[PDB]
Design an enzyme around this catalytic site. Structure first.
Site, PDB file in Angstrom:
ATOM      1  N   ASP A  75      24.865  31.648  27.654  1.00 23.05           N
ATOM      2  CA  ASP A  75      24.550  31.383  29.077  1.00 23.05           C
ATOM      3  C   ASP A  75      25.701  31.878  29.973  1.00 23.05           C
ATOM      4  O   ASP A  75      26.845  31.340  29.852  1.00 23.05           O
ATOM      5  CB  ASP A  75      24.288  29.886  29.162  1.00 23.05           C
ATOM      6  CG  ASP A  75      23.832  29.369  30.495  1.00 23.05           C
ATOM      7  OD1 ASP A  75      23.778  30.140  31.473  1.00 23.05           O
ATOM      8  OD2 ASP A  75      23.516  28.190  30.523  1.00 23.05           O
TER       9      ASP A  75
ATOM     10  N   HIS B 255      22.702  35.757  28.887  1.00 19.50           N
ATOM     11  CA  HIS B 255      21.612  35.602  29.873  1.00 19.50           C
ATOM     12  C   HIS B 255      22.180  35.331  31.260  1.00 19.50           C
ATOM     13  O   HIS B 255      23.240  34.725  31.381  1.00 19.50           O
ATOM     14  CB  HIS B 255      20.553  34.585  29.422  1.00 19.50           C
ATOM     15  CG  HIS B 255      20.938  33.154  29.331  1.00 19.50           C
ATOM     16  ND1 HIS B 255      21.084  32.364  30.439  1.00 19.50           N
ATOM     17  CD2 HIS B 255      21.046  32.336  28.257  1.00 19.50           C
ATOM     18  CE1 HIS B 255      21.329  31.117  30.065  1.00 19.50           C
ATOM     19  NE2 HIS B 255      21.308  31.068  28.718  1.00 19.50           N
TER      20      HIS B 255
ATOM     21  N   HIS C  24      15.713  22.412  35.724  1.00 16.07           N
ATOM     22  CA  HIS C  24      14.753  21.294  35.939  1.00 16.07           C
ATOM     23  C   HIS C  24      15.265  20.354  37.039  1.00 16.07           C
ATOM     24  O   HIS C  24      14.811  19.199  37.071  1.00 16.07           O
ATOM     25  CB  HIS C  24      14.458  20.597  34.601  1.00 16.07           C
ATOM     26  CG  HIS C  24      14.108  21.573  33.526  1.00 16.07           C
ATOM     27  ND1 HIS C  24      12.858  22.154  33.431  1.00 16.07           N
ATOM     28  CD2 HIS C  24      14.853  22.120  32.535  1.00 16.07           C
ATOM     29  CE1 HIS C  24      12.846  23.002  32.417  1.00 16.07           C
ATOM     30  NE2 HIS C  24      14.051  22.996  31.846  1.00 16.07           N
TER      31      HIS C  24
ATOM     32  N   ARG D   2      16.842  35.874  33.096  1.00 18.94           N
ATOM     33  CA  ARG D   2      16.109  34.632  33.409  1.00 18.94           C
ATOM     34  C   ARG D   2      15.662  34.681  34.868  1.00 18.94           C
ATOM     35  O   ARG D   2      16.445  35.087  35.729  1.00 18.94           O
ATOM     36  CB  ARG D   2      17.027  33.445  33.140  1.00 18.94           C
ATOM     37  CG  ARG D   2      16.345  32.097  33.283  1.00 18.94           C
ATOM     38  CD  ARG D   2      17.157  31.122  34.083  1.00 18.94           C
ATOM     39  NE  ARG D   2      17.758  30.119  33.238  1.00 18.94           N
ATOM     40  CZ  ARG D   2      18.011  28.878  33.618  1.00 18.94           C
ATOM     41  NH1 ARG D   2      17.707  28.453  34.833  1.00 18.94           N
ATOM     42  NH2 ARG D   2      18.544  28.048  32.753  1.00 18.94           N
TER      43      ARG D   2
END
Lengths: 390, 390, 390, 390
Positions: free
Chosen positions: C129, C156, C169, C204
């Site tokens: 990440d 990513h 989220h 992403r």
């Protein structure tokens, strides 16, 4: 050749895992250092404790960089403390600093390359202080691998007790037995063979000034024993060139280069040591600490100071280093600027700027600080990223 | 007083947890910095990038230390990279360096104290560069607390975009909206109130030279808009003293001290800025970057260079700093020693040693490197530990 | 192929310096990851936040490791703080953790090798990440190179604003313009080409749930604009699969693998996204976050939960990862042991030990903790060092 | 009281500098630990190697945290390596981890406080492993101060040789002379007195199993000597409870709490040791390693396992700790999840999630990961910063 390895290739194969990781900077460094040491009259270097110090050393045409554990203790360790030279700091500080220096050199290489210049060779080999290894042979094994990971070309190890270790010019130094010091040198070669890199190993002895020994276990050390013991149970020994020579000769099969810590820049002493080593080990590389704890002008007349390194080179001292040059340059230059700035403000700073402009005659460029740190380089990066469509 | 806090004590109480941790060095630092700024004609300081540089600054009688983000980028960051001044390094690098400096000062205090000396006040307040906060207001909140933990006395924040942030003397600077910059200053005061420390907050504006703005959202910034937009969608604005003055006045209620980044050491400009601020905020502390990117002798005659800081003090510039003094002193001194060492070996090093001996007349002691780093202090520790029976 | 690079080999040559440093683990990792992604039904992996977690993942037969920035924020960052997922931590934390993991895997390889075992392939590729790159494209360039240095196989990047970035989220996510997100992907490929490593790049998008956009500058984003703006000056956009699909299609030429952050494990949604991408980019690798913030048993019946990854694989989701598995396993297992230990002392601990003994049936060996951490390996090192004479 | 300090307040005053820095967490920790040890039947704790492990320990109602050097070696050291327990890692790793843990606890305190809860006392005292001090008494002095800076409540030191130091359950352990071990305990009390903090000092002996001694210098150790010496020159000694008892009694005047490393959880042995100490030092605090290297169910029947800690408490073992609980919980839980995830994908992960939901009955909250790491807390920070006008 003729280096002794008291272990086999099979021993190395068993301990090196199933994949071999490449250490480009360490391999280049050891190769270039080994060529230089065999082709030049000698290599002279200065202690560096920041990437910028090491960059200016290379920029000025020095062919090697010295990483001082003393300087790490003072002003560049991972505990962020000011320490004296007693192995007080975290054992990864030195290798971390070697990485930072190679990072600075890599950025210099990137700047000069992006401008179509190759006139400076940026990847000067780094010779790094591993002290007495920050414990036993396994600690030696770890710091050696850490230095190779960081891209060191050579690493030095001394025969002082790690837990009571001291500056080479502090009183009350404690030798470990000959066999223990050789075991550390074997640990260091094992670490290099396991990493698959021909890293230079320097064996320092502190036996010139050291009057204490931890243990009478080794037959080779007993001749120096007086028969006195201290409260701590250390053995009293006869320090001097005979003890230094013994250790030097014991370490020679296990190290690429030998170094006698000296209490005084004395060419006759240097010659006697050299001749003692070469009598059994013809052509053996030697190294010499041109110590800043020596009062050069008080001990030597101008002719000897000017000739000193050249004379030492002819004896076999192919690597000569001022261990604490970085400390002295950093502390002196900020004190001097500060003291004048306190009184005269921007007159004091303009005086430094004018000194910088004068040094541009000899290739100094850091006056142009924006280019020096890679502003041009990262502006070329930004322009490539922004450059093409969508 | 009269600082604006657009939040309540209850807001602070809710966010500060149930226990209050003491930050002695940060509390001492902010107290001493605030007294000095109100009692002295002005405070002048130099950029420090190692504990030893900051130690020599204090030893020479400077009353404050400047921590430069530019210098951190170049040679003292936690990525161990050489960077230009574009917020490229890890956001904790600055606070970590403030800790290292206070560690060096604490060790100096310990040496002088163990010898029965209190003639140097070692805990000089540190004013530290937080850049544009390494993202949004929460990133500002974190770097502010990290600096207080490290023992900073004051922290500065600028109104450039963090993701495209640049040296104050690089072209193509991007302002964030006034309201965004004030939100960062509120985040910084909230962090200090939450830690329970009266930390000094400096608001820098880059609006003197900045010709680009991220967003037309703020009514206060639209007067400077030309109506052009770029590929990136930045708004073109009329850079200059009118934009700088606007921002300065917008930030004054939210900061202890105001700083206009300047492209040139110009006393008339300085006076106009000062008078603009004091017209609405009588007695407001100002700060001035005495930039090393200025050619002092080319721009000013000797009388003006010598008078410069004193004149600036009388206008209200109570904190004056040479941001990159540490970089220039470090790079200059090692280049100069290296260039001479390449040719003349130990003659070059003896020349530095002789300069060091001359500086002893003015209180320099680092020539005696063994005492300087605490060898005497740790030998007193060893002797207390070894001293009593069983 | 068919990846777009909006720059030339000459651009890369100018920016890469004069020497090419080998990154063995990064090269192996990218090669193995690329083979696996094209030969297996799919790769499933779990978040790891320590070297030991990643070692047990490999030991249990998982073929890849996921490095979560969320987990770094929580419990494994270089600020040593507990953070939520808002890019609050030092930008080098992730690459540092990738190094630690490869160090643990390298030690496992050394143990198994020293015992004559090659039944586990230890060097599982790590997909890491990089968040939104910790600022602008130059920050992206630096974190990409840091990950390659650390030995990551893939990295990513997401199209959220770095300064206001959030958990996938969390509400109130902010998209950057399409052109800005593509510029980050170009920065990442430039970093990989400069290092000379075929590193996998994952793009992403957060456009499924993101209702805010920083700038209307890009023609491609305006169709999603409502015409409302907020206090901060963010543009309101219509979040959903149409926005996600747009971004996915814009990023596909610039990334090896595409990932739509999802608010719910929905196979029909997944299929619609896959079919939308493959309609323009036949065979394009996709990645899927099997989120632990989903209540798997509340949303899906047992048959769907058991089939879920296999179904996703057949659609083109060749890399599937539980981002926060490491956090949940670590927090759950210590809470559960702690709660029982509070009441029942060594009965609670014997229960864990018994669970460990049961797992030995499936290749678990950490019950034998002395061997697990390399005590046998370092005892072989000690024995080689001590083994031969003198 | 009755602790022996073989030095004076004047010695401490000379070595502590001119300013006293407050260490709030260390002061709170030592105070609370000392109250607990004198008011509770006993304190039981588990090894923690991350801030999240230590947070769950406190959340489950454990009153203390154990910081294991073994666990640091395995998975949480500043070299980012997997090591066995041989003091191989950087000496600041332990104190750094104590800081990270207190940071996690401080964030928990901030979350619970911002929600109007004070039902958990978050600042549980941390007892930390200083090994054999990472060299000599000055290294001991530094790690002790580093632990107090980090906020440790207590620190333990063992009488093994630092350079050949080993796991308490490894063969071939080497004792240092009694006088050397006492000198380390004096160094540790001197460090605490210099920092002005009543830090708890635990003296561990390894003399139960240790069959080797470095030096015959101390009259108190000679009774255990056989008269054999090894290649290395170590002295062979009669390991067992008589040697352990001797050392325990020698260390008692210099330490707050005594700990005998044990090869087996044996209550009769424990009682004999306790009675031996209390015969000369009535009421002396003892500590007991409930070792995970013991096969609890193979050595003890269920009644003894359930009674074990309670029995040990009544003998005087007021601090009882499972040193490697963190390692076992972390490695077990990820292996088990990984092994099941390899075969059954999201069924395996849903099983963990369901276990987490079950633990919510007993106060577990990390299933709600967003709140657990401070997303709510930082959203309150953002809202205060954004909240008031201009």
């Amino acid at each position: 050749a003729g280096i002794v390895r008291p272990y086999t290739p099979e021993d190395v194969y068993r301990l090196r895992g199933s994949v071999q990781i490449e250490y480009t900077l360490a391999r280049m460094g050891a190769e270039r250092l080994w060529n230089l040491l065999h082709t030049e009259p000698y290599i002279n270097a200065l202690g560096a404790l920041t990437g910028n110090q090491a960059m200016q050393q290379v920029k000025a045409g020095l062919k090697a960089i010295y990483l001082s554990g003393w300087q790490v203790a003072a002003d560049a360790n991972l505990a962020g403390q000011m320490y004296p030279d007693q192995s007080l700091y975290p054992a990864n500080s030195g290798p971390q600093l070697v990485r930072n220096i190679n990072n600075a050199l890599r950025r210099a290489d990137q700047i000069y390359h992006s401008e179509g210049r190759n006139d400076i060779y940026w990847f000067a080999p780094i010779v790094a202080d591993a002290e007495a290894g920050f414990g036993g042979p396994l600690n030696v094994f770890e710091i050696m691998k850490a230095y190779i990971e960081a891209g060191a070309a050579g690493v030095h190890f001394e025969d002082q007790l790690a837990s009571e270790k001291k500056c080479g010019h502090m009183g009350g130094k404690v030798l470990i037995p000959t066999q223990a010091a050789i075991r550390n040198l074997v640990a260091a070669r094992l670490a290099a063979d396991v990493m698959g890199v021909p890293t230079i190993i320097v064996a320092r002895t502190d036996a010139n000034a050291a009057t204490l020994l931890t243990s009478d276990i080794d037959e080779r050390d007993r001749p120096f024993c007086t028969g006195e013991r201290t409260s701590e149970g250390f053995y009293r020994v006869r320090a001097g060139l005979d003890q230094a020579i013994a250790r030097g000769l014991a370490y020679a099969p296990y190290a690429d280069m030998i170094w006698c810590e000296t209490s005084e820049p004395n060419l006759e002493e240097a010659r006697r040591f050299a001749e003692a080593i070469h009598a059994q080990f013809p052509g053996k590389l030697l190294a010499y600490n041109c110590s800043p704890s020596f009062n050069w002008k008080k001990k030597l007349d101008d002719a000897t100071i000017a000739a000193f390194q050249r004379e030492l080179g002819a004896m076999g001292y192919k690597f000569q280093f001022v261990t604490l040059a970085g400390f002295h340059a950093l502390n002196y230059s900020m004190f001097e600027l500060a003291r004048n700035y306190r009184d005269r403000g921007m007159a004091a700073y303009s005086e430094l700027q004018q000194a910088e402009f004068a040094a541009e005659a000899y290739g100094y460029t850091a006056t142009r600080h924006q280019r020096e740190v890679g502003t041009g380089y990262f502006d070329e990066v930004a322009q490539v990223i922004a450059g093409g469509e969508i």
